[PDB]
Amino acid sequence: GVDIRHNKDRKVRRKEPKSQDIYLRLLVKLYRFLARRTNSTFNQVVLKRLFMSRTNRPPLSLSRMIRKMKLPGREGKTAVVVGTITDDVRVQEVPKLKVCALRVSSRARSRILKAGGKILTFDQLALDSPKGCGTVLLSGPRKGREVYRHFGKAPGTPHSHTKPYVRSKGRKFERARGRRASRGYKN
């Protein structure tokens, strides 16, 4: 008899993508290979991200991709995003970029290409740079989802600012006993 807890012996990370789609799965076959045979950890990070959920690979807006490449020095590079590239209607002038993405929305595609931008697929990125050399690996804001505003220290727990799940906002949906001082108390 041995004393170990077998409690957290199984690591819960993903191995493959849970999706069954065939084009992504080909990318996975390609980046598994590169991951293992190259020294590049870029390939490993990319590989890891191909297995993740929709939630877990959030969309990267065009404006966010602009400003991250506006940063000093990462000039004449390629931005990479395992998610999708979306438009920003609240940005106007779009520099000529180099981009990798699993998806780019039709607007975002036009705007970039009109600028003299190049768009790449991930099979194309590999041939272009199999060890991820000269890349900017970005990500969309993970904690964008409105979901997260309900997460945390519960509402009605002093110093929480945590959206309650409520049928409809309005004068008479919550905001009585436990928010006003006038009505019982407040947190």
Partner 1 sequence: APSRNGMILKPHFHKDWQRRVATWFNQPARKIRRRKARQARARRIAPRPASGP
Partner 2 sequence: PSRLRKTRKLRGHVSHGHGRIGKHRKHPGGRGNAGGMHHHRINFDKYHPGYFGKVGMRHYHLKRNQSFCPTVNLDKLWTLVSEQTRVNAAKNKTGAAPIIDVVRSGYYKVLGKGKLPKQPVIVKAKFFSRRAEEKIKGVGGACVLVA
Partner 3 sequence: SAHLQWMVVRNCSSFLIKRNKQTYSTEPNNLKARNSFRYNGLIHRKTVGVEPAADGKGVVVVMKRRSGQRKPATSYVRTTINKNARATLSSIRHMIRKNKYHPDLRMAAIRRASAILRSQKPVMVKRKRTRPTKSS
Partner RNA sequence: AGAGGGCGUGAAACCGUUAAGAGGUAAACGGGUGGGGUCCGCGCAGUCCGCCCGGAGGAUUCAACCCGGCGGCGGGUCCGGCCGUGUCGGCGGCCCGGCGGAUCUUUCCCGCGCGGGGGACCGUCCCCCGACCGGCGACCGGCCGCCGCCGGGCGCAUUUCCA
Partner RNA sequence: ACCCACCCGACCCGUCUUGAAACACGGACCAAGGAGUCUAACACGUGCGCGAGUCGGGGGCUCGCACGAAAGCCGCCGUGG
Partner RNA sequence: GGAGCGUCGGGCCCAUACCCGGCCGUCGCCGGCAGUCGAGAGUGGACGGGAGCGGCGGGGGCGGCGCGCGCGCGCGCCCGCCCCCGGAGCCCCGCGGACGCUACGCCGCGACGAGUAGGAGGGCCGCUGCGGUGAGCCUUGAAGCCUAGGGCGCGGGCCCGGG
Residues 12-51: x/- map of binding to partner 3 (CB under 8 A)?
Answer: ----------xx-xx--x----------------------
Binding to partner 1 by residue 166, rule CB under 8 A?
yes
Q: Would you count residue 89 as binding RNA (CB under 7 A)?
A: yes
The dihedral built from the CA positions of residue 44, 106, 70 and 115, taken in this order, carries a sign that is positive
When the beta carbons of 48 and 163 are compared against partner 1, the nearer one is 163
With contact defined as beta carbons under 8 Å apart, do 179 and 186 qualify? yes
124 binds, among partner 3, partner 1, RNA, none (CB under 5 to 8 A by kind): none
Q: Which of 121, 40, 109 is nearest to 80 (CA)?
A: 121
Q: Tell which positions 155-174 bind partner 2, by CB under 8 A.
A: 155-157, 164-166, 171-172, 174
C-alpha separations of 6 from 2, 10, 14, 15, 55 in Å: 11, 8, 20, 21, 30
Q: Is residue 21 close enough to count as binding RNA by CB under 7 A?
A: yes
